[PDB]
Design a binder for this molecule. Structure first.
Ligand SMILES: Nc1ncnc2c1ncn2[C@@H]1O[C@H](COP(=O)(O)OP(=O)(O)OC[C@H]2O[C@@H](O)[C@H](O)[C@@H]2O)[C@@H](O)[C@H]1O
Ligand SMILES: Nc1ncnc2c1ncn2[C@@H]1O[C@H](COP(=O)(O)OP(=O)(O)OC[C@H]2O[C@@H](O)[C@H](O)[C@@H]2O)[C@@H](O)[C@H]1O
Ligand SMILES: COc1ccc(CC(N)=O)cc1OC
Ligand SMILES: COc1ccc(CC(N)=O)cc1OC
Ligand SMILES: [Fe+3]
Ligand SMILES: [Fe+3]
Lengths: 383, 383
């Protein structure tokens, strides 16, 4: 028997944030804490929301202390600001980093036992729902607005840990490509292939079933078709990417992912590597590694990614789907090897250990050994 | 900007009702009123739930006063039983009739200004969320467990009225084919083609967009592929039907349907016709009427319904999709003509008026006139 956690309410398309003032008035909320980062404030992205809230007469304080790969320190700082703001709800504005930080604050606020943060790892045994969250992504992205997962960095144990908890699901998501247009091309490409990694990994994960298969294959189709266009700055392509990344979240949240995310998390913890860039470099190599344990699913991936698989053997089709991902990586300007983003050969043993102990690795369709992950890192490292 | 209302939590597959006791304990609810009908009690379908609740020690009273095409009288009776039960939440067990009745009780309970019931018609301006509903369907399917819509019969004005309200969305849906297996073949076929009508109408509705298109086309594929098998009594086909009917609900709830539902509602009000039988007889005739206003969408329908469209013109493909639905109706034992279920030529003028004033008619891709609907009824009436 399979469980689906989704957003009760979500708005999609350009101008979707225009619905926020109305959703807040419907629920009777009094004051927001906006969780965001400094970049989004001084790009005027936060202003696009706070201007509408001022016009609607809705009170808000702001915490913009979030950094890429949010730390336990960041979570504690924000939790402190939330308590002193007298706010009764949360508005996450940004990529995975502010949205994951927002979820941590929301959970600990109503489950104060978890103030240390690192005790949220795995299936968080929280008694109480999160402080209500309204989620507004600015990356096409991590689907943080719809997933029941969030990833915090333990600076002292030098690892990223996943917390999975139905209590952290946002009440409303606003998926507005107007909020995402300010992404630099490199960021559109990184977060774009993070979305594709969620969809491919989710499609082949051990817990996969009919409904998540249907969602993931549609998300791969939307992302493969739109990402080149979005990175180039096309407006309609940006709107497609915004939807594609969300539809991936509806799936992988509820069944899981695999060794790509398992091997990407240690890279973030060790080097502060952008999550999408780590994922994008590993994805094709892990896809090749997983090929023989995926049944017919690489034929479907290859097809919706624009490959003619009419009269291909299964191994030829599996190779074609891997090659489709290498090509898309090349076109959107992602460095092809881990060496290129500052990963060090010396660390691979330690990284392979952390990858094997990651929550995401358990979902991988092929049972990965330390020997295998060490070899994968080395394959992804070279040149 | 498009809004999606979905279930925050849902369980799918045989044994899914096994998750109900746990969901109730998580939320801290004290006593249920089970809304159902007499048939489901004395078929032991309700027992499959209440036995698990007794084992978990969870209190419940029962209202089984629901009849096909539930009336304002039924709603008032149930609202009375709810008030005298001291219950704090609702469990809907049955098809569209109990589930729609449950939503009416839940809404009026917390929005008591709507005690007349008929003032819920259209976009219900309710201030308060429904009394929490846990939804367990026993038909395949009206998708009442996931839609924000419900249909009540006004005995005094002899018309069915649709109420659309995000506040009525159930907290949890349990989609268990074990609960649906006792459906007689005729009921599997009726509710089966009601699910197909939701998917086809939803696919071509005026408000249709990318995400609902993706959901509806997958639901048509699941239903076309499984309905003959389910009517024959196949267990796995019943499980597919259970998912297919739900996936249709995820779409049509959020964008609407068309003139099939518009023309089916008056038939229920006048003759107490089973909703699915009325829908199934009208669907192919309304599909023909709509054909020129649907873009490429009948090519997609035809394809996922098992028709080879590789080298077909658009008009030939549109004709093939209409013929696919006539054939599926023939195979599951739905008669071709409205005369066959007791519709009277004398009433067509009155029925055409009621159809034009139905909420669902506004979604129809071709703007329907009274003259047109009169002609459609006559076309659907006899050969
Ligand atoms: N619209 C935007 N315009 C400009 N800069 C932006 C925009 N959105 C985000 N940025 C900037 O991009 C950088 C990356 O932001 P993140 O929130 O880290 O982006 P994302 O890739 O969505 O998040 C990754 C995070 O999600 C988790 O799942 C994962 O483990 C990782 O911690 C930051 O400097 C942020 O301010
Ligand atoms: N598993 C089952 N086994 C046997 N009989 C069943 C089962 N489930 C339902 N029934 C019986 O089928 C008959 C029809 O039940 P409904 O609830 O009316 O069926 P459904 O088609 O799901 O609902 C139609 C209603 O919903 C609205 O969408 C529509 O406008 C109409 O009011 C009733 O006698 C009911 O007891
Ligand atoms: C285990 O599944 C997950 C793995 C990673 C994340 C964070 C992310 N968006 O990449 C969320 C998850 O869902 C619970
Ligand atoms: C207007 O849309 C609807 C019309 C009819 C129903 C009930 C049904 N299942 O036929 C639900 C709806 O969604 C809000
Ligand atoms: Fe990710
Ligand atoms: Fe219906």
């Amino acid at each position: 028997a399979n469980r689906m956690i989704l957003n009760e309410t979500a708005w999609f398309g350009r101008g979707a944030v225009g619905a926020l003032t109305d959703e807040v008035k419907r629920r009777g909320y009094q004051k927001a804490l906006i969780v965001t980062d400094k970049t989004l404030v001084q790009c005027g992205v936060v202003a696009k929301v706070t201007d509408k809230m001022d016009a609607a007469g809705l009170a808000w304080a702001i915490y913009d202390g979030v950094v890429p790969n949010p730390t336990i320190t960041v979570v504690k700082e924000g939790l402190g600001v939330f308590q002193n703001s007298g706010a009764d709800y949360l508005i996450a504005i940004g990529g995975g980093s502010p949205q994951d930080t927002c979820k941590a604050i929301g959970i600990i606020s109503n489950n104060p036992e978890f103030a240390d943060v690192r005790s949220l790892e795995g299936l968080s045994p929280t008694n109480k729902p999160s402080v209500p969250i309204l989620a507004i992504p600015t990356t096409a992205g991590t689907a943080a607005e719809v997933t029941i997962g969030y990833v915090i960095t333990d600076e002292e144990k030098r690892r990223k840990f996943v917390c999975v908890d139905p209590h952290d699901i946002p009440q409303v998501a606003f998926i507005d490509a107007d909020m995402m247009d300010g992404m630099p091309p490199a960021l559109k490409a990184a977060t774009g292939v993070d979305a594709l990694t969620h969809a491919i990994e989710g499609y082949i994960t051990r817990g996969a079933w009919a409904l998540t298969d249907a969602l993931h294959i549609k998300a791969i189709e939307i992302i493969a078709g739109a990402l080149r266009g979005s990175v180039a700055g096309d407006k309609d392509a940006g709107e497609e990417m915004a939807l594609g990344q969300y539809v991936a979240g509806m799936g992988f949240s509820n069944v899981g992912v695999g060794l790509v995310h398992g091997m990407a998390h240690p890279l973030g913890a060790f080097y502060n590597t952008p999550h999408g860039v780590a994922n994008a470099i590993l994805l094709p190599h892990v896809m090749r590694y997983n090929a023989d344990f995926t049944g017919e699913k690489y034929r479907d991936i290859a097809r919706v990614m624009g490959v003619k698989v009419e009269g291909m053997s299964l191994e030829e089709a599996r190779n074609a789907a891997v090659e489709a991902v290498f090509a898309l990586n090349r076109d959107v300007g992602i460095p092809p090897h881990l060496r290129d983003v500052g990963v060090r050969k010396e660390d691979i043993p330690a990284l392979a250990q952390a990858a094997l102990d990651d929550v995401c690795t358990g979902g991988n369709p092929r049972e990965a050994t330390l020997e295998d992950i060490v070899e994968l890192y080395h394959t992804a490292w070279t040149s």
